[PDB]
Design a binder for this molecule. Structure first.
Ligand SMILES: O=C(O)c1ccccc1Nc1ccc(OCCCCP(=O)(O)O)cc1C(=O)O
Ligand SMILES: O=C(O)c1ccccc1Nc1ccc(OCCCCP(=O)(O)O)cc1C(=O)O
Lengths: 325, 328
């Protein structure tokens, strides 16, 4: 295999042969790729239109190089709550964890929201494991678990344009949770991302707000690719069906204040959006083992996690956990 | 403008707005583009099939930055003989055309190697290329010497390896700006684009693509010719069998050392498929030359002039004189 071979195939608008995407990603992560080669690959794959097989190979290589969490430290039913791209997902994650569903998130700075809240984001595998056990939630700092991806990440920022690489974050949570609510801002790639989760037998709702959000929106309908039993089912979701009023898009350090307000019981469109996304994660969680009863239960659990103060308390306990390390 | 804007537009499979390709090329040519940005643009512009307007803007920026030849040193009827990539055929055809009395000014880069092997000094500044054109009847613009700020793009092209839109610009960024030529293109889809760019400049060009894939007029089969003249483009099918040329095989048409030997053989009068191809392509450039000011009569004359340039020894002498020039 070679870069001219692989780049040539892509520029010819052909799908890659089995293993080729993997070879490319492994070159990129073993420091064997020039920035120009990385950029050419990211762009060419994007314009060719990536397959789930291809994106799967990319994510597979990344996870093969990643620092794992220690053995038997991630519950079988842990979930992620995240988008391709953060205020809504951070809150939803806390609420989901507070409802009793273990959450392990994965991210990087532009993570900023959590720091502003007093959470310690840069922990190693053993301490993330302890956080997950003792608090019910953990955060994997992406640079710390994916050191070899730094070359790729640098090129991402240099070219600016979105590419297939924008999918890899949610697909390479180093804790490897089997479930989640996953936002995707790119309607065409959402389906591909869903296929990758399907191949892994994950239980995920891949969500794309029809207003463009990488979260379940309250301003209008959302497209959901429901992934369960290795298959993908495409659905349109209307929050009005669960009694939610339509919000305006503009209503959705600043984030930290917003987090404190919602967890404190503030009513409004932000809370509604948090509750909706938290419920989505809980439905995805239920999928590891009916759509309407599942959503109704998810919504009850999410609302109760806030209203009882459990979500607010969990964040406080999370903050305290880090200050005691 | 900005890279996110232009690259986003290209990845969305949209043609660029007026000026955007120019802006991009200019960033690249002023050392203001990161290698990753250069590469992303090269690939995106390639996979979003480039338009004549866009390719014209790229070449235009390149020429706006290039060292020109001194005023009035390039004859109004000078021609180019070149392919996008057959360096053996175009090199020989170029010498033959010059020997027939049509000024030739070429533009090229090392992978030029064949000419050096023949003892020609290829790396000359504008003033000496001009002198070469006047005194010998042929000149060569060595690309790094005229396009110095292209070096960042050059490095990126080596790194990614695959052909891109940048592979199309060579015939369109000749710093001597000849107004006529025989221009080969290996990709038929882009040949029509190249013809469009030449038409915009009102060049008299034959853009040629062998139906066997050669970036020359072939003798193995027919060729497609985009005939550019009067700012308008006519697309034609061309069969050299109509001029009595025997069919050759693709294998009959090497490194710079071998190419030089082949050059010496042809200019020395060796008959065969290689000579035929040279004569045919030399004739084509002569036909393009005539178009600056009737199709079959033009070809018949072009073929007579090319054959005679070889057979009298004029072509062989011109090369000897070209080599002599560099040493004096
Ligand atoms: O930004 C991304 O696209 C990304 C996606 C998945 C995982 C990580 C990502 N980013 C990075 C990964 C590594 C990295 O660089 C690692 C530095 C850590 C050094 P050490 O080996 O000592 O832990 C930087 C980034 C980044 O976003 O800037
Ligand atoms: O490669 C370098 O980094 C370099 C360094 C110093 C001086 C020249 C350099 N390279 C070039 C600079 C300009 C240039 O200009 C080429 C323009 C024409 C391209 P084409 O013949 O393919 O149409 C080509 C090169 C090169 O190394 O290839």
């Amino acid at each position: 295999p070679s870069w001219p071979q692989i780049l040539g195939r892509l520029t010819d608008n052909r799908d890659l042969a089995r293993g080729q995407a993997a070879w490319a990603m492994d070159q990129i992560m073993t420091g064997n790729a020039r920035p120009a080669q990385i950029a050419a690959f990211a762009v060419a794959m994007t314009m060719k239109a990536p397959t789930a097989d291809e994106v799967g190979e990319l994510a597979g290589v990344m996870l093969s190089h990643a620092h794992p969490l220690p053995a038997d430290t991630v519950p079988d039913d842990a979930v992620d709550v995240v988008g391709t791209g953060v205020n809504l997902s951070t809150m939803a994650a806390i609420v989901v964890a507070a409802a009793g569903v273990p959450v392990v998130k994965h991210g990087n700075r532009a993570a900023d929201t959590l720091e502003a809240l007093g959470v310690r984001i840069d922990l190693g595998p053993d301490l993330v494991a302890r956080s997950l056990a003792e608090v019910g939630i953990g955060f994997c700092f992406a640079p710390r678990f994916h050191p070899s991806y730094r070359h790729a990440a640098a090129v991402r920022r240099e070219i600016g344009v979105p590419t297939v690489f924008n999918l890899l974050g949610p697909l390479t949570n180093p804790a490897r949770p089997r479930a989640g609510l996953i936002g995707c801002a790119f309607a065409d790639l959402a389906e591909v991302m869903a296929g990758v989760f399907a191949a892994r037998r994950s239980s995920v709702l891949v969500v794309h707000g029809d207003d463009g959000l990488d979260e379940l929106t309250t301003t209008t309908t959302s497209t959901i690719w429901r992934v369960a039993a290795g298959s993908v089912d495409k659905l349109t979701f209307d929050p009005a069906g669960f009694g939610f009023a339509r919000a305006q898009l503009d209503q959705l350090q600043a984030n930290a204040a917003a987090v404190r307000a919602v967890l404190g019981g503030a009513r409004g469109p932000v809370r509604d959006a948090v509750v909706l996304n938290a419920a989505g994660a809980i439905v995805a969680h239920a999928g590891l083992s009916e759509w309407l009863p599942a959503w109704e239960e998810g919504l009850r659990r999410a609302s109760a996690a806030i209203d009882t103060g459990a979500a607010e308390q969990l964040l406080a306990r999370w903050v305290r956990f880090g200050r005691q390390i």
